Every structure is written in structure tokens, then in C-alpha cells.
Amino acid sequence: SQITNNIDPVGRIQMRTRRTLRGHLAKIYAMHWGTDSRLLVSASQDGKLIIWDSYTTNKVHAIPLRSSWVMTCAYAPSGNYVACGGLDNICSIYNLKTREGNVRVSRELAGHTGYLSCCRFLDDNQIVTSSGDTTCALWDIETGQQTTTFTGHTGDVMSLSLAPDTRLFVSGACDASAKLWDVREGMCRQTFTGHESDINAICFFPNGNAFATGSDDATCRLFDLRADQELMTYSHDNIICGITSVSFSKSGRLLLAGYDDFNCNVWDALKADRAGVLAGHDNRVSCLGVTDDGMAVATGSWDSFLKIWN
Amino acid sequence: VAFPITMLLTGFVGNALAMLLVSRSKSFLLCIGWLALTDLVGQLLTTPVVIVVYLSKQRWEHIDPSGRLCTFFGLTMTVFGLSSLFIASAMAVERALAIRAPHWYASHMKTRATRAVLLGVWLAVLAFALLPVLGVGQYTVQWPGTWCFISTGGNLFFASAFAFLGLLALTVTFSCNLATIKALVSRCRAKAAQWGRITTETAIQLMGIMCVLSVCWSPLLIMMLKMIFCNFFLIAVRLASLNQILDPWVYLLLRKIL
Amino acid sequence: LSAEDKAAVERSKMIDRNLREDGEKAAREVKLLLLGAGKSTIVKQMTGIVETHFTFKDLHFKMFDVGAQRSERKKWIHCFEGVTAIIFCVALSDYDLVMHESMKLFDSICNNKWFTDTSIILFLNKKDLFEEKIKKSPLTICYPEYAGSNTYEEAAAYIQCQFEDLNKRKDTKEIYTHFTCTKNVQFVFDAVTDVIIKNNLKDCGLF
Amino acid sequence: RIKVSKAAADLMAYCEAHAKEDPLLTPVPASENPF
Ligand SMILES: CCCCC[C@H](O)/C=C/[C@H]1[C@H](O)CC(=O)[C@@H]1C/C=C\CCCC(=O)O
């Protein structure tokens, strides 16, 4: 942080809610952009997992669940599969491009004991889940059994983020200990502890050799995978609430953090300043994703509104 | 001369507030907003003519030949004025339904009938005000020479039907509050108590409604039946418009106010 | 704006009609938690979580007997904010069976920041074992100043007023205590028709 | 472990080598911006 004061900061950011996606009735805990930069999913407590088109803002599929308590969702890099998980301790997988018209469930992954916090696809054959019984996993869709299980901490895992090359991920947990794992061997490689309380979201820096941790004590930090220590903490003195989701931009210059004092923010991810607030959400925000092309964000919140910015 | 000036500005400052307050923030806020909006519009579309008419000092028949402006002002008062009783009555019947059939209210009345019967009250009210427009009854100029109501003479059928249909609202209101109150007390008597504070708050706020609609629309309705069968009638419309001034205050203000 | 777009928008409107129909069908159902510390007996006579669906007098409501997770209460209890009641359940035949933990749980639940409007029903399960165990042995040992008597009804009323005392700084929720004697599901029926009336009188706006 | 100034240099070098292709710090005109 000491070296960058010779760099011209970004001045101010203005973002406008270019759409508004309406139709949910309960609150919202999820979204995930496709690699299409076009379609998103969203998961709610109505029992509905709705796939939205982000251009015409109308439904393409409204998948009806069984367990109406979902806390995460995923959308495959092949554009074929959605996943959902929650308090049922079951990760359901639905397929989209089917022979018939109606949508159906493919495989019911049923091998956890705690609830589900995240799940992210690797191929159409490998899904990595994280749970509340202090263990991640790595699954296999046709086999049905987990081919590698990571049990490296005491705190319940809360987030997950694969690398850009999809060889080793990162998971932070309720004991403030963010670990760096490895998919091939199956054991931890480093553990970073810099936070004073538990951890709600993590994503990688888009290069693949840094990551950002959002905690529940109104502070974010930026860890590096080669110096193995904290670089910045981002914190303003007028915050009480706790971060709920975190994402980066494509150039690695904006760090968008989804706070819990009713509105998101934008953090300069190199100068530790506050650029511009995504204000106007009515209830707490739960989720936000920048597209792969890097053209929008789509924040969801307990207000039943999924709004798409810039 | 100061009476329309007072009832203009006092009613305006009464009903500006509620529009602002209501706008920012259920199946009650819309049905107090549509009372507030109709109440203010009926105060803005009617007062300018009188305020203008008596600056001048000439007979209404001189300014309007052919009898169109009195026909305009004899339909507005009925229309904007009666609605208001039909905005107070609807609200009251709904407040009974809540306590008397506790679950029927949840499944069947989710804001898709608070834009239905409420925006149907105006239609019911109006397939009656336009009967002098088709030849039955007559809106004529009264003793002051600034406003208009039903001639005393088939006109009686318009004059007696106004009294009958203005009685429905008043009666419905009184029945509904007493029915609600009785049910509330009996439901609170057999306990064995914070449900008691509900009874005091409601009792107070469901008797203000029952007293305003019998200090204001009492004389205008009771004298018209005798007229069907000098100065008194003049006060009968200042009372029956004062409810409109206070309509905005009682439902969503004085309780917050104090 | 070819025929493809019009077909897509008609599909979207059919989806929204089905979505709003299912949503409206959902809201005439009384979601209810089933928190606890003899829950099995209660759910009999009335992994993950289990939802039990049953209908009484033209009013079918589900019931979410959570308790198989045992991971953390701080992280998934805020998905339960919109709920009508909480059928809390404690057997009172365990005053000296190695009740303070139950009182701690009730203190943590009744004062929670997501549940300042939910009317906590409470059930007290095992009464025959309690009266035999109080006829045989006294209960002046949970506190050294617990009871000033040793009969059944004074002890039962003392325990009931002891659980109803932990309601800290609330005059918006109403504990409906019972003793688990047809007339065991009748009580939740007659105590859920008393919280939806409280809610209607706040809906139409009256207090 | 590598020097933290070297990792700082690497991250700021990735920051300055993609400032042109960022549609959320230097926005594109609305001809191509698909919303
Ligand atoms: C059935 C009656 C409905 C009328 C409702 C209407 O919105 C009332 C508004 C009043 C206000 O209080 C005084 C005033 O000039 C307005 C129009 C009514 C009075 C006309 C005669 C006034 C005068 O000559 O004194």
C-alpha cells in the first residue's frame, strides 16, 4: 500500500440500475452469471430457481425445487447445468439442454452432514461443494461419491472460489482461517489468519495469485498467495454491519463488496479508498457477480429485487 | 366571505400532509391515499368558483346563462362528497372482516380488490349524479347564490333516493364498528393481557370515526327527508364539508400527532 | 422483433401466471418452527430438516422440526424470519437429571433480533413422570430457594412462571403455555388464530 | 516466501496492463454497451 501513492487514483464512479428483474416473492441468497455474459440464475425461498435473461429481462426457465431453503447456486461453464444446495444437506443438479421441453433433476448428491454454503462447477463432471461441518469436498456426477474430501479446519466453511486455471481453490471459514487447498492431492497448503471474526465471502483476484476476504466485522482484506500475509485492510469508520458477498472486476481495479447496511460499495483495490456507493437497495444485499466480459453487476437482496448495474 | 377562504386553506394544509406521508411508506395505505386524493381534489375543483364568484358580487344567473355551470357544480358536490362516505364505509367493513373471520381475510384480499371495489365506489356513485343530465331531478342554485343542490319540486325520487343512499353509508359504518367492538370485547373478556391494550387503542380510534360521521352528515340527511315530506340549510353544507377537512386528520394523523 | 420475440414474451407471461398462482397458493399456509432441546412424541401425536404437513379444520400448515443439523444457530436462523409461531417444547420431568441449559436456550431464542414479533408457543411435555417424581422426591435443589412447597400444582405453576419470566423487554409477543394432556392440537389451533388476528389488526391499520 | 514489494509490483503491473479493457472504470459509449 505504501508503494502505490505515485499512481493516479480513480476519481469517482457513477452506476445506474440499467434494468430491474422482478418476479421473486421471498428473499434472495444467490446468483451466478454464465460464461455467456447473458443468462443468470437466482435462488429464493419461494422454492423457485429462476433463470433470467439479462437483455430482455424475462424468464427462460422457472425451476421448481423441493427443499425451499437454498443458500447457494451454480451455473455451469458449459451453459448446461444448474446446481442448488441448502439446509437439506443435498446438492441437486438440474440439466437445461434436454430433449423434451420441461426441466428435470439429473443427480442428487447426498453425502454431507451439515448444510451447504457454496458449490462451483469445474467441468460437466466435477463439482466442488463446501459445507457447515468444517469440510469441503469434490464430487463426481455419475459415480455419486466424493473422490476427495478436505477436512482442514474447525470453523464451518462459508465461501469458495476456484482459481482461473481451476487447479486449486480457496475457502474461508467461521474460525477466521482462510485456507488454500489443492484439488489434485487433496490437502491444504497454506492457512491465513488475519481476521478478528468469521468470514462470509471470498473470491480470487482475476490473475490467480491473490484473493480478497470479506468478514463479519466491517472489514475486508487482501491476501497474497506468495508473500503469505495481509497487504491491505479496507475499512471505513462509519460501518457497523458485516460483509455478505465479495467480487472483483476484470482488470483487478475495483473490489465490489456487498455490505449489510442496506447498500453495496466499490473499493479501490489498490489504494484502499472508497470510490462510489451502489445505493438504493431496500433490504440487505446477499450476492453480486461481475460478468466474465465485465459489463455489469447483478446484486440481489432480501427485497425480492435483482437489479443489474451499469 | 371568509368561510370558503378558511375551508380552502385549512383543508389544503390538512390533506397535503397525508399525501406526503402516505406516499413514502399494506391494504390500508392505498385506501387512505385514495381517500386523501379524492378529498383534496374535491376541495380544489369546487372552492375556486365560489372564491371567484363572490369577489364580484353578481347573481349566478347573470354569469352563467343556459344553466350549465350550476349543472357542473351540482354534480361535483354529490360526486366528490358522497364518495368520501363510501371510502369511510369500505374501510369499516374491511375492519370488521379482519376480526370476525380472521383467516378469510388472508387468502382473498391482497391489494387486487383495494383497486376494485374502491375504484368502483366512484362508478356506483356516478350512475346517479348524472340523472339530471338525462332529465330526472334538477341541480338548482340555493339561498346563498354560490352553490347548487336538488330542487324541491319525479324529482323527489332523486331527492328521496339521495337520502336513502346516504343513509346506507352511515348505517353500514355504525353497524360495522359496533359489530367489531362487541366481538373484540367478548374475545378479550374470557382470558385468564396485552390484548387489552389493543382494545383501548381501537376503541378510541373507532369511536372518533363514529362521532365525526354523526356530527357532520347528521343535519343534511335529516332535513332532506322532511323537505321531501331558511338559514338552516346554509349551515348544512358547511358541516357536511367539515368532515372532509377533518377526514384527512382523523384516520392517519392525530393519533401520530398525539 | 420477429415471431421469436413474441413467442418468448408469451412464454414469459405464462411463466409469470404460473409463478404468481403458486405464490398465492403458498401464502395460505402457516409455516411454523419446531425448536426444542420430547419433540418426537409431540410430532407423533400431532438428514437435514423434516417438514410435517397436517390439516386441521380447513387450515393445513407445515411444521419444520429442525435439530438434526447441529452446526451453528447463528448462520441459518435468519432464513426463518417470516414465520407465524415457534412450537418450543420442554419436558419438565428433568429438573434434576444432570433445565438450566433449556432456560439458556429459551433466553437466547426469545430475545433474538429476528424474532421480536413471533408469538412463542410453549409446550411442557411429561407431567405424569413429573408428578410421580415430585411425590417421591423434592425439587428444592435446582435452586436452593426454588419452591416454598412440595405439592404438584405449586411446583408446576412456579416452573411455568419461571419460563415465562425470561421474555425480556417485549410487549409484542405472547407465550401460550400448555401442559400436553383431540385437545393437544386444539391448543395450537386456538393460539394461531389469535396471532393472525393480531396481525390483521396491524394490516388494516388499527393500532 | 517472496518479497512483498515484489508481489506488490506484480499486482500493480497486472493492474496497469489492463486499464484499457475495463468497462467499469473507463466506460464504453452506449453504442456498444449492451444495456
Ligand atoms: C355533500 C357536500 C360535499 C361537498 C364537499 C366539498 O369538497 C366541500 C368543500 C367546501 C369548503 O369547506 C367550503 C367551500 O367553499 C368548499 C365547497 C363547498 C362549499 C360550497 C359552499 C360554500 C359556502 O357557500 O359556504
* Neighbouring residues of B111: CB distance < 8 A, sequence distance ≥ 6: B27, B30
- A115, C47: Cβ pair inside 8 Å? no
For residue C48, give the C-alpha cell: 437435514
For residue B80, give the C-alpha cell: 366528490
* Neighbouring residues of A277: CB distance < 8 A, sequence distance ≥ 6: A263, A264, A265, A266
Give the whole-angstrom CA distance, residue A73 versus residue A32.
Answer: 7
The DSSP string of A252-295 is: S-EEEE--SSS----EETTT--B-------SS-EEE----SS--
CB atoms within 10 A of CB A282: 12
Which candidate, A30, A21, A25, places its Cα nearest to that of A57? A21
* Residue count of chain A: 310
Name subunits touching B (3+ CB pairs < 8 A): C
Residue nearest to atom 3 of ligand 1 (CA): B81
> The CATH number of A1-309 is which of 2.130.10.10, 3.90.950.10, 3.90.1660.10, 2.120.10.30?
2.130.10.10
**Is residue C57 exposed (0-12), middle (13-18) or buried (19+ Cβ within 10 Å)?**
exposed
Write the residues followed by a gap in chain C (C–N more than 2.5 A): 37, 46, 98, 181
Q: What angle do CA A171, A177, A180 make, to 5 degrees?
A: 40
For residue B223, give the C-alpha cell: 332535513
- B198, C201: Cβ pair inside 8 Å? yes
Give the whole-angstrom CA distance, residue B195 versus residue B187.
Answer: 9
Do chains C and A touch, with touching meaning 3 or more CB–CB pairs less than 8 Å apart?
yes
Whether A87 has its CB under 8 Å from any CB of chain C: the answer is yes
Resolution in Å, one decimal place: 3.5
Beta bridge partners of A255: A248, A267
Return residues 111-140 of A near C (CB < 8 Å).
113-115, 132-133
Strands A91-95 and A81-86: antiparallel
Query: Is any ligand 1 atom within 6 A of the Cβ of residue B89?
Result: no
- Burial of B74-92, coded b for 16+ CB within 10 Å and e otherwise, reads bbbbbbbbbbbbbbbbbbb
Query: For the structural domain made of C34-198, what CATH number should be given?
Result: 3.40.50.300
In angstroms, how far is CA A128 from the centroid of its own chain? 13
Q: Is B96 within 8 Å of B255 (Cβ atoms)?
A: no
* Residue ranges per structural domain of chain A: 1-309
Query: Nearest CB to D25: which of A205, A229, A254?
Result: A254
Indicate the SS3 state at residue C182: coil
Q: Is B84 within 8 Å of B247 (Cβ atoms)?
A: yes
For residue B232, give the C-alpha cell: 338552516
Which candidate, A102, A104, A135, A103, places its Cα nearest to that of A118? A135
The DSSP string of C36-99 is: ---HHHHHHH-----EEEEE-SS-EEEEE---S--S-HHHHGGGG-S-SEE-EEE-SS-TT---
- Burial of C123-141, coded b for 16+ CB within 10 Å and e otherwise, reads bbbbbeebbebbeeeebee
Give the whole-angstrom CA distance, residue A310 versus residue C156.
Answer: 64
Ligand 1 nearest atom to the CA of residue B42, by list position: 7
Which candidate, A151, A141, A86, A77, places its Cα nearest to that of A109? A141
For residue A146, give the C-alpha cell: 466424493
Query: Is any ligand 1 atom within 6 A of the Cβ of residue B175?
Result: no
Residue with the three cell numbers 446438492: A91
Q: What angle do CA B63, B64, B67 make, to 5 degrees?
A: 160
Give the whole-angstrom CA distance, residue A42 versus residue A72.
Answer: 9
* Neighbouring residues of A15: CB distance < 8 A, sequence distance ≥ 6: A266, A276, A278, A297, A309, A310
Q: Give the CA radius of gyration of chain A.
A: 18
CB atoms within 10 A of CB B229: 7
Which candidate, C45, C86, C84, places its Cα nearest to that of C65? C86
Give kind and range of the element (H or E) at residue B130.
none
Whether C97 has its CB under 8 Å from any CB of chain B: the answer is no
Query: Is any ligand 1 atom within 6 A of the Cβ of residue B244?
Result: yes
Query: Is any ligand 1 atom within 6 A of the Cβ of residue B83?
Result: no
- C76, A90: Cβ pair inside 8 Å? no
For residue B157, give the C-alpha cell: 325520487
Whether A209 has its CB under 8 Å from any CB of chain D: the answer is yes
Give the whole-angstrom CA distance, residue A165 versus residue A187.
Answer: 18
* Neighbouring residues of A2: CB distance < 8 A, sequence distance ≥ 6: none
Give the whole-angstrom CA distance, residue A283 versus residue A263.
Answer: 8
Q: Which domains does chain B have, with CATH numbers?
A: 2-257 (1.20.1070.10)
For residue A166, give the C-alpha cell: 481451476
- D15, A3: Cβ pair inside 8 Å? no
The DSSP string of A204-215 is: E-TTSSEEEEEE
Indicate the SS3 state at residue A85: strand
* Residue ranges per structural domain of chain D: 1-26
CA distances from B85 to B16, B177, B225, D26 (A): 20, 15, 19, 59
CA distances from B98 to A166, B239, C57, C82, C201 (A): 58, 32, 19, 20, 7
